[PDB]
């Protein structure tokens, strides 16, 4: 699964 802390600017619905 994606690492949500790779880029904090990435925040999909």
């Amino acid at each position: 699964n994606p690492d949500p802390n790779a880029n904090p600017n990435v925040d999909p619905n």
Epitope: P2, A6, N7, N9, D11, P12, N13
Partner: antibody, heavy 121, light 114 residues
């Protein structure tokens, strides 16, 4: 209009440190993370780290974690990257960037103009 | 490191011709939960920073000319320029934001024959 404006090109001796500034304007500074990315001659773009401009938390690449410090000053909406123990091989263009802001309210991607840093005796 | 590999390294077509750039990720950047691919395409010209063209693999950024389109899923991605214009000569890069560190491909240099 959303912008990032970087400090001017610099030259430093081997073993010295450099500090590049990144002045943000035209958006809510504290909402987003500023990344630092370097581009060395004929080399692929290298992500160095990010800072959350709000709380100041950072994440650094393994390649740079012992030598890089990313900081921010909310009062001046400016972020900074300091690279210490400079190698002549750290000669590169250093960018700050709001990489892929992809949220329910915003979809943008903004880069500073780049700061060339040469490490030379 | 999710390694991003681009093919070809350089291409040259005449004005108005279709241009195709391939990008392969060493690990799948697909997330089944939201059906998204964590991939972007950038254009860079000399002396300028890269400029974002496509994100989520296939969503063209508003204001980007619609001759630019992205496709693919998992580990195989394609940037298409349907009709290459003179201003499109540049190096094009794929980019993944699935895992840390963020990485970029080696670039494909797109050139005009005239």
């Amino acid at each position: 209009q959303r912008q990032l404006v970087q400090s001017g090109a610099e030259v430093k001796k081997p073993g010295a440190s450099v500090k590049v500034s990144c002045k943000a304007s035209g958006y809510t500074f504290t909402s987003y993370a500023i990344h630092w990315v370097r581009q060395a001659p004929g080399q692929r773009l290298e992500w160095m780290g990010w800072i959350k401009a709000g709380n100041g938390n950072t994440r650094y690449s393994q390649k740079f974690q012992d030598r890089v410090t990313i900081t921010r000053d909310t009062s001046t909406t400016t972020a900074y990257m300091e690279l210490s123990s400079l190698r002549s091989e750290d000669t590169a263009v250093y960018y700050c960037a709001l990489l892929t802001v992809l949220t329910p309210d915003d979809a943008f991607d903004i880069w500073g103009q780049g700061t060339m840093v040469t490490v030379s005796s | 490191d999710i390694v991003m590999t681009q093919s070809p390294d350089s291409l040259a077509v005449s004005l108005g011709e279709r241009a195709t750039i391939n990008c392969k990720s060493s690990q799948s950047v697909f997330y089944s939960s939201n059906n998204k691919n964590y991939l972007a395409w950038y254009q860079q010209k000399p002396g300028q920073p890269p400029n974002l063209l496509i994100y989520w693999a296939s969503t063209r950024q508003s204001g980007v000319p619609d001759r630019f389109s992205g496709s693919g899923s998992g580990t195989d991605f394609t940037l298409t320029i349907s009709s290459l214009q003179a201003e499109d000569v540049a190096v094009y890069y794929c980019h993944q934001y699935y895992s840390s560190p963020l990485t970029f491909g080696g670039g494909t240099k797109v050139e005009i024959k005239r």
